[PDB]
A paper describes a structure:
In malignancies with wild type p53 status, the activity of p53 is commonly attenuated through overexpression of [name], a key negative regulator. [name] both inhibits the transactivation function of p53 and selectively ubiquitinates p53, targeting it for proteosomal degradation. Binding is achieved by recapitulating interactions of three key p53 amino acid side chains (F19, W23, L26), with discrete pockets lining the hydrophobic cleft. We have previously described the mutations M62A and Q24R in the N-terminal domain of [name] that impart Nutlin-resistance by selectively reducing affinity for Nutlin but not p53. Here, we present the three dimensional crystal structure of a stapled peptide antagonist bound to Nutlin-resistant mutant [name].
The structure of [name] in complex with [name]-M62A was elucidated using X-ray crystallography, revealing 2 complexes in the asymmetric unit of the crystal. The p53 peptide binding groove in both complexes was occupied by a single molecule of [name], where electron density in the 2Fo-Fc could be observed for the entirety of both molecules. Additionally, in the [name]-M62A:[name] crystal structure the peptide binding groove is capped by the helical ‘hinge’ region of the lid (residues 20–24), where the C-terminus of the stapled peptide packs. This helical region of [name] interacts with the C-terminal amide group of [name] by forming hydrogen bonds via Q24. Interestingly, the greater helicity observed in the C-terminal helical turn of the stapled peptide results in significant alteration of the C-alpha position of L26. The L26 side chain packs into the peptide groove in an orientation that is very different from its conformations in the p53 WT and PMI unstapled peptides. Apart from attenuating the binding of Nutlin, the M62A mutation also causes a significant change in the conformation of the aliphatic staple. The absence of the methionine side chain in [name]-M62A causes the conformation of the staple to change as it packs more closely against G58. The plasticity of the stapled peptide enables it to respond to the M62A mutation by making compensatory contacts. The capping of the binding pocket by the [name] ‘hinge’ helix is stabilized via hydrogen bond interactions between Q24 and the C-terminal amide of [name]. It is clear that this movement of the ‘hinge’ can be accommodated by the Y100 either projecting into (‘closed’ conformation) or out (‘open’ conformation) of the [name] binding pocket.
Author numbering:
A (entry chain B): 18 to 110
B (entry chain A): 18 to 112
C (entry chain C), D (entry chain D): 17 to 27
The structure:
Amino acid sequence: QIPASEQETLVRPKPLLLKLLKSVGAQKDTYTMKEVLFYLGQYIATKRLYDEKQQHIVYCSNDLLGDLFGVPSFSVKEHRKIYTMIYRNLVVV
Amino acid sequence: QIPASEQETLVRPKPLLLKLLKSVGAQKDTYTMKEVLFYLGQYIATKRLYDEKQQHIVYCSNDLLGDLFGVPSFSVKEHRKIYTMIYRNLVVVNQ
Amino acid sequence: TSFXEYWYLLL
Amino acid sequence: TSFXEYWYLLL
């Protein structure tokens, strides 16, 4: 898991990520990293981007998320890569 | 707030609940309570049944979830009520 | 608060 | 394993 201390960081999502978060009802311009992770997980479930059989696989080549991360797909098991990909779309307050 | 002991309690979902779980990729007859809550949470998000503005509100009158819970809507804040509705739709193994 | 956090708090 | 558990294990 992402450490607790790394999730309490106050962050400002960049335009594209901000658009993504607000598309599932996120309200604000600033979030804790924890909140970003809540809404991003929610987003993926809501758009049904997870593979039905192997549900750690997220297919985003036809989604805003794929443009955001710049990959056709990724695995939720790749904790470091997701951390990195998320952080490219954030600025710390 | 399901206790740590209760999280790992093994359960067998009744037919309607099992149908719901399998509709979002669950593929067995026996689950822990934790797993049921995982898939159920996933289901609600996948079907977009939560109010976008106040996301504790779940609408389900025209959904399979409403049939098995027996309610037209509920709040995620109603922890006791949800547990009660979930336990009505499963049998605890060896009870 | 997201539906994901509310349900998380319910778990 | 559900996509909800995988992401939960990332959180």
